[PDB]
Design a protein around this nucleic acid. Sequence first.
RNA 1: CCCCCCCCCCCCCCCCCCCCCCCCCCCCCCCCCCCCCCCCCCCCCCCCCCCCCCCCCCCCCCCCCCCCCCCCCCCCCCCC
Length: 139
Amino acid sequence: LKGLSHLHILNLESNGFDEIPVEVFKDLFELKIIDLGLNNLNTLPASVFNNQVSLKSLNLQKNLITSVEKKVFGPAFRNLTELDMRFNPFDCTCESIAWFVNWINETHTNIPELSSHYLCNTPPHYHGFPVRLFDTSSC
RNA sequence: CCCCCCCCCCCCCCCCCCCCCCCCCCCCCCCCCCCCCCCCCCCCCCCCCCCCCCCCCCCCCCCCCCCCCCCCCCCCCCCC
């Protein structure tokens, strides 16, 4: 993907990806839509979406993602229009989704089916509970 | 100067088997859209038929009144 300065739409859905190299998206400054759903992604390297300063739509549904952290999704979640991370095994813990749930609480990005398909998986106390109802007052 | 036999390690290639990953096809279930047919409920429309009510018309019947015509009967007076 190097040198594709004018790339706008990238679709990499359902390729079986387990890990993403940190510097695969570094040249894609004008990228607006990236689709990475239906892969096997769980852990992402930090600063992998740093150069995506014009990203408007991120799709990561039906992956194995458990934690959404600022060091990875910070620049990606800056100015979005649509977010799609629905069917993921979210780990509802203060070090996994606390920044993400705070971001969900105040944001203008459209997140469809937020109250139904964003469900905790672990710990068993939270299994099945909505991610948006996680309480961060004791973090 | 010259062959053969063992040892370790590195390989190459052809098969077998097991793994993840993906594609295509199919099956099961569910959902959505469309089409067709059918049932149920309610509000109606038009037409036909039957019945009833009101009003009116025409005809007829019964009774009564008026006029005209006709007939009978009673008083009274003259003419020859």
